[PDB]
């Protein structure tokens, strides 16, 4: 189940309202941000946002200014073909697009978005995971190097208290920068923890 939550932040550009889990009909009525094309064109992530908002377990948290959406965080279930969803079950939600608009970045927008997202207890019955790679990031938009970029997301994503986890994914390990962020909920089962431990390390015989 879902309980609505909200909070407000203030900056030079005005007041930003961070709606928590929100009903899909209202997202269908917002106006997208033209600058926020980190993953897909606006149409495609609009379809994604409404679809996950319609899922019983998928959730969307939106930080916005007025009637225009500027940042979103998704909690969609892991991709069925992806190895993290081999069980294809429950209590496993993959965090996806968390990035915000370029010129609103540096305003503590992402950390506030994640904290407003994560204070909910329904964030904590399920553990949260996300997989980050170097090619998904703005290489030239902000013009700073690899490891500082990883460190600054570790800082900005520690707002939810997420600790870094290691995995043997051939895709993750192709570059030491690409890694896996995740949180372990306080209401989750120990069997779920062992299951996630098994899932993270597929071919453990090598180490």
């Amino acid at each position: 189940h879902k309980t609505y939550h909200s909070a407000n932040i203030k900056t030079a550009t005005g007041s930003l309202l961070i709606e928590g889990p929100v009903s899909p009909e209202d997202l269908a009525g917002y106006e997208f941000h033209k600058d926020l094309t980190a993953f897909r064109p606006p149409r495609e992530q609009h379809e994604a946002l409404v679809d996950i908002a319609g899922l019983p377990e998928g959730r969307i948290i939106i930080a916005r200014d007025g009637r225009t959406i500027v940042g979103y965080v998704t909690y969609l279930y892991p991709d069925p073909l992806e190895r993290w969803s081999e069980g294809n079950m429950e209590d496993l939600i993959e965090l996806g697009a968390i990035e915000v608009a370029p010129d609103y970045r540096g305003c503590a927008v992402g950390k506030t978005l994640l904290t407003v997202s994560m204070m909910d207890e329904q964030m904590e019955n399920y553990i949260v995971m996300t997989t980050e790679y170097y090619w998904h990031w703005d290489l030239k938009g902000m013009k700073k190097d690899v490891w500082e970029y990883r460190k600054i997301m570790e800082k900005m994503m520690n707002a939810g208290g997420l600790v870094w986890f290691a995995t043997d994914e051939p895709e993750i390990s192709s570059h030491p920068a690409n890694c896996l962020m995740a949180r372990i909920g306080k209401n989750v089962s120990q069997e779920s923890i062992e299951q996630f431990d098994r899932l993270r390390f597929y071919h453990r015989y090598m180490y």
């Binding site: 064109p41 790679y133 290691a166 390990s173 090598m206 180490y207």
Partner: protein
């Protein structure tokens, strides 16, 4: 690629060339007790020989995990292995040439059980917990093993009723209900005594069983002989560089072959100090292990090293890693990047070692007493004639593709593929050249030789016709791997062969010669998760 210069020191293989020219297995066998006595056993010479020598009070096992930090010496390890062998003989009804299987995670009891099983002559076969019920059931069905030791978390994964030849199932720890064929280890060791009347073996009977997931879908049981122990010792003397003061840490699991011979037998045949780190992988735990334990010799795999680099070098800088002396990698051709990272962090060099299950113990190894080429496995150990052969068994001059073969006759061989002499005779080639199925080649010196997708991916987006793409490495027999890209064009652009070459030249001029894609395929859209992330494992699985 620049060869790593050697470091002067009190090594064991003073001169590799002179030994390779004048090495006989007789002097190697002279290092063993059976050469004078005639009583031979691999487990004996790995444990008891040192437990009776001056290494009796020397730390043999360094066990650390999230809960336990236990330490065992050679005398204590001998006592534990003898107790395990006693309990296996008394309860498991095991005799010479039998099959005893291991279903355990990393723990001292695993090594105790396997050493005890080998000591009584029972052929030991390890297993991995990641296997489902099907894999373990198939392995015991093929092996017809009488005994399988297990853990309570995995007791439910073995079909005891299904297997007719399976007789006893041992469980270790916890509180498992004592069924008709389910006996708990802990008590069975508790009242059982220590002293073991070790049964002495011939040169040509087996002591290790290992099942490898074959291409046909069914595993095969490789049976190594006690003679292999000879080779192990010498390798554990030369490539592993175990001196009398070295702390050796092997990160491989004992369920695999690599953690069975060079994580168990090779270090202890030289009387060294093995380190075992249980529990989940965590770079904090590994770096703390190296720091406070003072690991000198390291034997790990490129996957674990790559995950350690993924952790971050600052976390390594949080600990003291200057105690390292000698680093080695097994299980996959070492990357030069891992070599550079290891040299930068630990100030020590890593050495890739090659061998597989059908090989028994490592043959072609990078050597601390010679210049190290990071991309090369190394040179064959003395007394072992490794080379490159074609499909006809004829030798081939260096610097050309070919199938790596070994001159049959070396002590470390499979005595059989269990209940499958056909797969035996398929492994060896006419002319006495055992074939391992791997591709390799040598160079003039005598060493042997077996890409970031994002830089191509970032290059692709610069076209005004493509919005996104995915690049994978398609395996190649000539260049190793060829670059293949799947392209989803933007609106107003149609797939064609004319524009395919335009992508190749633009990448060619803007990037390296080998960075240009060799295969281009067009899609309406690439596989993407619901959020928008592009995964490439599905792309290579499709290809």
């Amino acid at each position: 690629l620049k060869a790593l210069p050697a470091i002067e020191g009190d090594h064991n293989l003073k001169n590799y060339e002179e030994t390779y020219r004048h090495f006989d297995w007789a002097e190697a066998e002279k290092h063993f007790s059976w050469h004078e006595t005639g009583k031979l056993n691999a487990a004996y010479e790995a444990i008891d020989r040192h437990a009776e020598s001056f290494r009796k009070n020397k730390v043999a096992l360094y066990y650390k995990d999230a809960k336990r930090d236990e330490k065992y010496t050679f005398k204590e390890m001998k006592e534990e292995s003898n107790r395990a062998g006693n309990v296996l003989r008394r309860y498991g009804n095991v005799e010479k040439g039998d099959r005893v299987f291991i279903f355990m995670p990393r723990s001292p009891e695993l090594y105790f059980i396997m050493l005890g099983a080998i000591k009584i002559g029972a052929i030991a076969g390890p297993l991995f917990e990641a296997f489902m019920e099907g894999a373990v059931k198939d392995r015991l069905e093929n092996s017809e093993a009488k005994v399988v030791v297990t853990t309570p978390e995995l007791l439910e994964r073995i079909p005891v009723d299904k297997l007719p030849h399976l007789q006893h199932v041992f469980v270790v720890g916890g509180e498992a209900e004592s069924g008709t064929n389910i006996i708990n280890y802990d008590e069975a060791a508790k009242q059982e005594s220590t002293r073991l009347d070790i049964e002495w073996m011939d040169k040509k009977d087996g002591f290790l069983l290992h099942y490898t997931s074959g291409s046909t879908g069914t595993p095969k049981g490789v049976l190594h002989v006690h003679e292999a122990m000879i080779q192990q010792y010498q390798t554990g003397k030369w490539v592993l560089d175990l001196k009398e003061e070295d702390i050796y840490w092997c990160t491989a699991d004992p369920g695999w072959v690599t953690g069975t011979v060079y994580g168990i037998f090779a270090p202890w045949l030289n009387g060294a100090t093995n380190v075992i780190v249980g529990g989940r992988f965590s770079p904090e735990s590994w770096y703390g292990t190296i720091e406070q334990l003072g690991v000198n010799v390291w034997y790990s795999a490129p996957t674990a090293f790559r995950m350690l680099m993924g952790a971050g070098d600052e976390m390594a800088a949080k600990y003291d890693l200057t105690s390292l002396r000698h680093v080695l990698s097994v299980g996959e051709p070492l990357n030069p990047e891992v070599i550079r990272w290891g040299h930068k962090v630990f100030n020590k060099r890593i050495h890739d070692t090659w061998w597989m299950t059908e090989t028994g113990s490592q043959l072609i190894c990078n050597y601390p007493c010679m210049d190290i080429k990071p991309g090369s496995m190394g040179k064959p150990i003395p007394g072992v004639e490794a080379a490159i052969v074609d499909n006809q068994g004829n030798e081939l001059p260096p610097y050309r593709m070919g199938n790596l073969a070994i001159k049959k006759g070396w002590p470390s061989m499979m005595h059989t593929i269990w209940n499958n002499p056909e797969k035996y005779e398929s492994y060896f080639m006419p002319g006495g050249w055992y074939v391992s199925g791997d591709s390799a080649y040598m160079d003039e010196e005598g060493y042997f030789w077996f890409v970031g997708p994002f830089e191509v991916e970032s290059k692709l987006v610069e076209h005004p016709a493509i919005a996104e793409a995915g690049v994978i490495g398609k395996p190649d027999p000539v260049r190793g791997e060829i670059i293949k890209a799947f392209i989803a064009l933007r609106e107003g652009f149609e797939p064609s062969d004319k524009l395919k070459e335009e992508i190749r030249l633009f990448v060619k001029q803007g990037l390296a010669a080998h960075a240009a894609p060799r295969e281009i395929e067009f899609k309406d859209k690439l596989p993407k998760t619901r959020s928008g992330k592009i995964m490439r494992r599905v792309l290579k699985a499709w290809e």
